[PDB]
Structure 1
Amino acid sequence: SSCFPITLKFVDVCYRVRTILSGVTGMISPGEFMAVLGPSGSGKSTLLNAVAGRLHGSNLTGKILINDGKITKQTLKRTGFVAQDDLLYPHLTVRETLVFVALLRLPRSLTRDVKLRAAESVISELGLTKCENTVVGNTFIRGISGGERKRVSIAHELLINPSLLVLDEPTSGLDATAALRLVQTLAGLAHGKGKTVVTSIHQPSSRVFQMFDTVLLLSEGKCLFVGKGRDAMAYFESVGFSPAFPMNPADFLLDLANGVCQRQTLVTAYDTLLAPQVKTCIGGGITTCIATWFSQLCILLHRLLKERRHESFDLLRIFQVVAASILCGLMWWHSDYRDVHDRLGLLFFISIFWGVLPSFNAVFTFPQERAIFTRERASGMYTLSSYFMAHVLGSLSMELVLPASFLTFTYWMVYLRPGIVPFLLTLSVLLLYVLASQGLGLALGAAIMDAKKASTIVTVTMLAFVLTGGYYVNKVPSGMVWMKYVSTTFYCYRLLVAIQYGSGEEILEEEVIGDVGMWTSVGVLFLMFFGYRVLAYLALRRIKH
């Protein structure tokens, strides 16, 4: 219950890029709820973002100090920044969202019994105890309300028990009566638990402004007032400013910020009477560290299990595989093998279809989760190498179910080779070709990080793999014959003809007998399996935070 108070002080100076801040000074006591209010463009989104400790070094000079000391990464585990946008996964319920977060945030030396009841204490500490089985959703999946998405985001940050909670415009997008009941619980933290809540309200209401203990005006840099907030109106009356009509106190002193009198004399009056009074108050880790890698993998596989299933077994993607499998069983119904030219066109349609679908659907995976990943990683929850291996191991499970259902339905209708040993070789070649074609699309989406531009580069790439696959053109013109050795469609189609026909000898046009080999064609699809996953990792470690 916060038996470690943080007395935040800051006497900093400008933050340039023009100056955003210029001269801000102030101090925050434990047990106070403070609002930082000002016009749009006054740098209130930077004073919060530089007193949590997220801006430093180059163009930020000052003497920000926590607890009469220095802002250190030791005194940054007791600090929580609730940002302005919410980044949650949709298909998880509210209770299992905060249990997956509680197993990753809280340290390893505890047990899994004082760790998942610290996640259902925060359920009842905020108001999230009625909606704990509703899914979260988004604006395509019906779930919790917009005032309870913000309460999950604050509950995401209270699991580590901070002593300083910085929030960046919480009540933005909330209606009139949920923005009031969210200020009631943030004022209850600082008055009941002894924390040091600091927030920046955009345009406060009339009875929201009564819930504050301290305000701080910012007008394009320097500050005009810092004080109790019940005596802000009486202060400017002594300077000679009073409203002409009954009005909100937070509309009055925010009009005085952007020059509208009812801003040159206001700054000079501040550094004569009020600013020189707040200045007066101024041998292991080898075998365990590999075992902590795999528990981060076992939790990241269970979180993303319903996310790797929504995109895989989509209902408009089941319809495309069921439609393509009735058309193959009807155009090649009860086929004969003694007419080679139709049997080779069946086997080449399977190479086109299962190279285009896994590659095109794989370019959307990494661009859509870049914002969630770079926030979740820069708080010490996981690294790149365990998030990457949860997408690798979780996507080669789900994507083998629709090609195995295509080939059970179609193999025995179209009369391919009878036997259990030719059926299992045709299935094995096709499931390796689907995994080698997926990795082409994973590498292209990670190198580009735009879903529209990556979609037209995997489309152009597969066009050159189909045309060099060996079915349309018989005599490649002598400077383009090298190009077929880099395509995945070439090695699959030359394998499938080797199961069904072998090398002549029963059917003897020598488009059956090839020029590659069989172990050379399965040794290269393994090189393209691993090789396109290594290049997807290196394109992702290039986005240096």
Structure 2
Amino acid sequence: SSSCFPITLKFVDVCYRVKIHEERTILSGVTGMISPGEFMAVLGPSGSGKSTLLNAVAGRLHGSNLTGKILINDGKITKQTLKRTGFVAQDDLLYPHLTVRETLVFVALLRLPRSLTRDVKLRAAESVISELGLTKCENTVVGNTFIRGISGGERKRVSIAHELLINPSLLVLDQPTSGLDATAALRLVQTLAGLAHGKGKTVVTSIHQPSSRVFQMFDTVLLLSEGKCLFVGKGRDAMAYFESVGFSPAFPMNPADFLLDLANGVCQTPNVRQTLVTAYDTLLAPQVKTCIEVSHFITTCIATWFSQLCILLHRLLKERRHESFDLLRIFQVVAASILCGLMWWHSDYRDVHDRLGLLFFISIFWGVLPSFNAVFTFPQERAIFTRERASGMYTLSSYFMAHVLGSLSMELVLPASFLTFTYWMVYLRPGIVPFLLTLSVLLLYVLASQGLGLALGAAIMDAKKASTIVTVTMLAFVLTGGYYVNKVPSGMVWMKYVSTTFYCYRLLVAIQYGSGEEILRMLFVEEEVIGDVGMWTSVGVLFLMFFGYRVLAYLALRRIKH
């Protein structure tokens, strides 16, 4: 009911220039201060630079283009201050397969301060549904362009409640009432004004068509016009200003309509906007800037990480329930396995050259299949992972060990369904011990080759550009794999040791043909089991690749900090 950790936002001489395809100035000398307990509205035409100003003061724009001082409590934007900052963008990026209640319950479980009952977090999640009026669309999905779900004015309020279930100190909303009608925008502005006045927060909105009652609820007003600001001050002090300059309406009208006609160059009675720029820069802006220079300012760390892992994994399983593309994958891999078992039906144990071809086609198949599906994991989560990474929703370790743990359920049943037909139709080395060793080596090789597609795809966050890198990489792995080229040059025999197909192929041949004595009694001293690498330094390098490719996939997602 009372205040919180206060944030005083100060932006001093913010400029932003882009390069044409000289420069053009999107913002040029914006200066203001938003104290705690204040409700600022950023008004302006539809070209001004309001979303770049609100992306600059939320820490979402940075680089060599910005030329200003964004000071949160007289210090720069750290990651410790981006956790108490809630940013509602214009574009609403939500997960399409969860419902509204499943979305807001996951946000309330992740972001609320964790020294609370689960029932208190769920009651806080349903207390913001009833505040924004999301009760009729509570159990409706939040679908895509293709998936028809909730409305477009309910998708905005779901995104607002997404950042109300943080309890932030600085709330930066970019056009929150665009998409709501005349009486839900009034209730939303009443909610935000209650957050600013009662709870002592710092709310910064960019409202675009405010009513005359909605304009009365703002403390300060920043009027923007083509980057250059025209007015910083109280809302009730506007229209007492501009009569010192000489601009007054001919009709009793809305203050926002008049203040947005002046920002375009219309008075409804010759250089109106330049007159207002020169009038703001000499009568109002130094008195603003002298006002802003005088403002001076372990055992549960495992349980939090495991709760984040369980919440992220349970969300990850809730969106693969929408797809029924799991019986087609099984019925096609089983069909390919019946094909591979029927082509080698007349194969015998004594035909070693006929069976090393089968044991190499298995290594081609289960190195090409998982590695080419794993390049869609991280590129298809890019637009939401960037937003929830900039927001500070979770740690990267809990997010990474949920696509890892979420992939180890059907990438272990597809080679197990392949092998139970292909092993016994071809009738390889009989017994439960070689069958289970072949299954273990195949399940290890699938996880080792899946990490290659994870890493190529975390490094290149595009599933089309990564699908041609991983194709040539896996074909180079198949080429230096052991079945092709006889007289390899002496300078290129080292290239098979970085291949992951080589170790699986050597392990399968060593399981099938033992050590090289039970087949030579029956009859291939260089191509089969007699080789250089052993059976324990081939599972060691497969485990090393299984861990190292996921370490590289984690380090490639660590570069995305924005």
Tell me which moved more, 146-155 or 314-323.
Answer: 314-323
Q: For residues 543 and 397 of structure 1, do their structure 2 counterparts lie closer, same or farther at Cα, with a shift above 3 Å needed?
A: same
Shift of 1:428: 0.8
C-alpha RMSD over aligned residues: 4.3
CA offsets per residue over residues 82-141 of structure 1, 9 Å max, x none? 122333223222222222222221113223232222112112121222222223222233
Matches of 2:559 and 2:75 in 1, distance apart?
36
Moved more, 171-180 or 476-485: 171-180
CA-to-aligned-CA distance 1:344-393 (integer Å, 9 cap, x gap): 32222211111001111112222333443343234443322332222223
CA contact (8 A) 1:308 1:394 kept: no
Give deviations 1:478-522, integer Å, cap 9, x for gaps: 433332222111221222222223244444996454443322322
Q: 1:281 to 1:404 in 2, by over 3 A?
A: same
Q: Which moved more, 1:219-228 or 1:89-98?
A: 219-228
Q: Structure 1: how far apart are the matches of 2:479 and 2:12?
A: 68
- Contact conserved, 1:10 with 1:65, CA < 8 A, in 2? yes
Shift of 1:260: 5.7
Q: How does 1:263-412 map to 2 (within 5 A)?
A: 263-270=273-280, 286-307=298-319, 314=326, 316-333=328-345, 335-412=347-424
Q: Residue by residue, what CA displacement relative to the aligned partner does 1:390-446 show, whole Å, maximum 9, x if unpaired?
A: 222332233112211222233323322332222211111110110110111122222
Structure 2: gaps spanning 5 or more residues:
19-23, 293-297, 520-524
Whether the aligned pair in 1 keeps the contact of 2:334 and 2:418 (CA below 8 Å) is yes
Match of 1:502 among 508, 511, 514: 514
SS at match of 2:407: helix
Please say if residues 165 and 197 of structure 1, whose CA atoms lie closer than 8 Å, have aligned partners that are also in contact: yes
Question: 1:13 and 2:30 equivalent?
Answer: no
Moved more, 500-509 or 360-369: 500-509
Q: Is this contact kept in 2: 1:13–1:23, CA < 8 A?
A: yes
The 2-side partners of 1:535 and 1:164 are apart by 35
Contact 1:147 1:178 in 2 (8 A): no
Match of 2:168 in 1: 162
CA positional deviation for 1:196: 5.5
- The change in CA–CA distance for 1:363 and 1:250 in structure 2 (over 3 A counts) is same
Cα offset for 1:5? 8.6
Q: Which runs of 5+ in 1 are unaligned?
A: none
The question of whether the paired residues in 2 share the 8 Å contact of 1:312 and 1:399 is answered with: no
Per-residue deviation at 1:172? 5.0
- Identity in percent: 100
Instruction: Report the counterpart of residue 295 of structure 2 in structure 1.
Output: none
C-alpha spacing 1:536/1:411, structure 2 compared with 1 (3 Å):
same
Task: Report deviation, 1:249.
Answer: 6.9
Deviations 1:325-353 (A, max 9, x none): 23223323464334334333222221111
Equivalent residues, number: 542
Residues 119 and 159 in structure 1, CA contact (< 8 A), matched pair in contact too: yes
**For residues 47 and 426 of structure 1, what CA distance do their matches in structure 2 show?**
60
Q: Contact 1:2–1:163 (CA<8 Å) still a contact in 2?
A: no
Per mean C-alpha deviation after superposition, the further-off stretch among 439-448 and 348-357 is 439-448
What aligned pairs does 1:71-470 form with structure 2 within 5 A after superposition?
79-162=85-168, 164-171=170-177, 197-202=203-208, 215-225=221-231, 239=245, 253-259=259-265, 262=268, 263-270=273-280, 286-307=298-319, 314=326, 316-333=328-345, 335-470=347-482
Shift of 1:24: 4.4
Tell me by how many angstroms 1:469 deviates.
1.9
Moved more, 461-470 or 302-311: 302-311
- 322-331 or 334-343, which moves further after superposition? 334-343
1:155 Cα shift?
Answer: 1.0
- The TM-score, its normalising length taken from structure 1, stands at 0.82
Instruction: Map Cα deviations across residues 268-292 of structure 1 (whole Å, 9 max, x no partner).
Output: 344676668878998xxx4443443
Larger CA deviation: 206-215 vs 38-47: 206-215
CA contact (8 A) 1:2 1:161 kept: no
Find the aligned partners of 1:312 and 1:439 in 2 and give their Cα distance.
25
Q: Deviations over 1:448-482 (max 9, x none)?
A: 33322221111111111212222233332443333
Q: Secondary structure at the match of 1:10?
A: strand
State whether residues 160 and 176 of structure 2, in contact with CA within 8 Å, keep that contact through their aligned partners in structure 1: no
Cα drift, residue 543 of structure 1: 4.1
Give CA-to-partner distance per residue, 1:135-186, whole Å, 9 cap, x none.
3222233322222222221111112334653211235567899878866765
CA 1:191 to 1:290, structure 2 compared with 1: closer, same or farther past 3 Å? closer
CA 310–405 in structure 1, closer or farther in 2 if over 3 Å, else same:
farther
**SS class of match (2:121):** coil
Higher fraction of strand: 2
**Deviating more after overlay: 393-402 vs 299-308:** 299-308
SS of the equivalent of 2:69 reads coil
Comparing 186-195 and 340-349, the one that deviates more: 186-195
Helix, strand or coil at the partner of 1:129: coil
